[PDB]
């Protein structure tokens, strides 16, 4: 037994290496700017009817 | 044996069935070669 404060399962589970040292100019990233850039890239890369009706290289020459 | 009738829900169900049939047909016709299955795996 050993008379530990925590149970056997609690000890084995919470002794895992992941639980190490665990006890109880300046800029912040601009999400809006990257969203706008992604939208702009999406536009520069390119309803009610059923789908069965509507549907009816930089390595090209390397040294080797 | 269900004694009920719906006006537009029947049309929606029929369209959904047709879409599912078309998707299954496309998948069956495309899976004839294992290259397509390998590509769809990733």
């Amino acid at each position: 037994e050993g008379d530990h404060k925590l149970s056997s399962k609690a000890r084995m589970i919470f002794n895992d290496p992941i639980f190490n040292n665990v006890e109880p100019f300046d800029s912040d990233y601009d999400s809006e700017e990257e969203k706008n850039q992604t939208k702009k890239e999406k536009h520069s890369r390119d309803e009610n009817l059923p789908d069965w009706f509507l549907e009816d290289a930089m390595n090209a020459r390397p040294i080797k | 044996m269900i004694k009920d009738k719906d006006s537009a829900a029947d049309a929606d169900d029929l369209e959904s069935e047709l879409n599912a049939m078309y998707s299954d047909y496309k998948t069956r016709r495309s899976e004839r070669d294992a290259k397509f299955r390998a590509k769809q795996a990733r």
Partner: peptide, 19 residues
């Protein structure tokens, strides 16, 4: 599977035109 066999071609076409 391939359940489309439950509908013959003419039934399927005449229901497709309904939509």
């Amino acid at each position: 599977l391939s359940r489309y066999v439950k509908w013959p071609e003419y039934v399927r076409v005449q229901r497709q035109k309904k939509i």
